[PDB]
């Protein structure tokens, strides 16, 4: 009985009560999310405590089979996933302190309410109020007030906890045989053992920087166009030669530029594409939406879904009788149970999100044959990229005309193409510099080579050079501006949104080439292409067994992120921008002084 | 004389796959039409015997093994398969003149709290042999150190449970399987089909 054989029999008695306990916990979470009561909260607490205790016990009984004495690769990956100490390396007091820090930060961010104007009677909260008044605001003074009000109260509470949180996380990562918490996070895009298909945790930084260097000129042109469009609407607020203000990007943190479309749309006289009217006058419901999504998937070639999916998934809100969060997510409860939880309205955006979550479900069903610890995407961007492939494909005018929402009388022109491409670039390209900036700042902070007394100083000097966003007012060191973000405050990796953007366009170009499609990449339809479906499924059914480097090559032919699929996707928009904004300055000045 | 072809198919409970129930049937009229009463039959493979010519032959003995497995483990109930059921729980010979019948039982079996009464063996020292039954629950020692009885690390009990919740998929739902294995020993046949 070799150590590898012992490892194979442990990870076969794990993969069996893990799956059972994970199904129990997932069912508890699902029934809570569909029915918010106190019994459901207690059931989640019990199931999660049992699952966590089982995971901890299984990890301590796995620390036995040494990795250097194992020659297999699947067993090696399973034991690597199971042997992660996590937060157990810290002392008891330090671990409880870190847990309290995380809980307090999450509660402060979720319950954060700014009441600066007038008396504290009038205060708004995140989803309807603050998001509504930041999304659609035409007042520079009001936008400045809201932005500086959140950045002041929330950041001043976050920073004293944030510094000690960073110290604790760095200590835990160092005890985990890593270099820092940034290295611990980057250790997900790591392949060690496979010849020809391998990766390093610094190679991720190098590749991300190189890809950003490649994408930069398109971002500069888009930024110049956005600045030119914003100056006309906002006189004397944006200098013709300077950078772009922080509070003017629709979102509170300027993550997405999608909401900056009313002041940016070039062809206002030309109406945008929208199928809501025909979709609502054709008597379409959530059942028909998901049936048409599954029709698209089976036309592509992927298998149809289980009968229990329809009878168990919650697709419509059951009135106000019971309370249920309707955030769209795809549930993989375990033993053959796939469910979709979303409040489906009859809208184009809800149709697209249904396609996105249905692609997530298809990915989940693809690798259901893999062992429990290998039932995930190859890296943490593969799932979102796979879903976004179908989300992009289902929104094409050709697919809409074939489906029936778009009348044949509508024609396709370069004007509508440019409109759609500009909206897509505002959604997608506009967030890549911000994501790279945020993750670079977090990596540098966790590295510790930079000092601590100029965190905000370096944050704002990196915002200007990388994103082109200038601080509207000076900020001292008492602020903790990056901690105002959901992922930064709640300890979430953010490079996944940069990686998924490249991966999705890689996949789209590969599948459009495999579908024998001729023409622009943005007018592509993977539907009715069994070859494209099979090519996608080849990578889709691998799960986490094969390295992401090989999984990428199995569908694309490359071995790392490539900007070129993005650039050929956005080439018509790039040419239009270059031809249009030639009379205006491109880029942001480095000599700006407020 | 009508022997329990109905009773083996229509039973309140079915034995686990690791310890299956085998019923020896003899001194009978065939009356195979009783089997076809159940409509939802998920599989009616008939290795070695035509599925319409059963009511013409005579066999010395007929064995009706019955057990409960998953939906995705029904494919392993066949001559020459491999997995965890076909080599540690229920192996059937390469020739296997007989029929395999399986239908879904997500209503009779299964329970929202978890039907843990149906167990299988996930670990055994050696592969099973055609029509062998291993009931012993000793502790499997997986390496280099005696378990010395009930034990925890590198030890590991052998029988694992299924759980069978009714919200499971189709390949994870309980599937009652009845396997008919006709024996053709060179003895006067006691089971025959009716004929005028
Ligand atoms: C949802 O919760 C309510 C709250 O009492 C209760 O009727 C039951 O637990 C659940 N009902 C349904 C229909 O899910
Ligand atoms: C690792 O073990 C599995 C057991 O199912 C086997 O399929 C696989 O081929 C092994 N790896 C290698 C590289 O042989
Ligand atoms: C799935 O789609 C196929 C189309 O090939 C259809 O025949 C089948 O009935 C569908 N099943 C369900 C459960 O929708
Ligand atoms: C796919 O093919 C079917 C049948 O040929 C057709 O009805 C449908 O409109 C096609 N869809 C697309 C997007 O080409």
Residue numbers in the entry:
A (entry chain A): 19 to 612
B (entry chain B): 334 to 529
From the paper:
Since late 2022, XBB* variants, especially XBB.1.5 and other XBB derivatives with a proline on residue 486 (486P) on the receptor-binding domain (RBD) of the virus Spike glycoprotein (S) started to dominate, which demonstrated enhanced binding to human ACE2 while maintaining extremely strong capability of evading humoral immunity. Interestingly, L455 and F456 are two adjacent residues on the receptor-binding motif (RBM) of SARS-CoV-2 RBD, and the variant is just the “flipping” of the two residues, L455-F456 to F455-L456, also known as the “FLip” mutant. These two sites are also located on a critical epitope that targeted by the public IGHV3-53/3-66 Class 1 NAbs. L455F caused strong affinity reduction on XBB.1.5, but significantly improved the hACE2-binding affinity of XBB.1.5+F456L. Both L455 and F456 are on the core of the RBD-hACE2 interface, forming a compact conformation with D30 and K31 on ACE2.
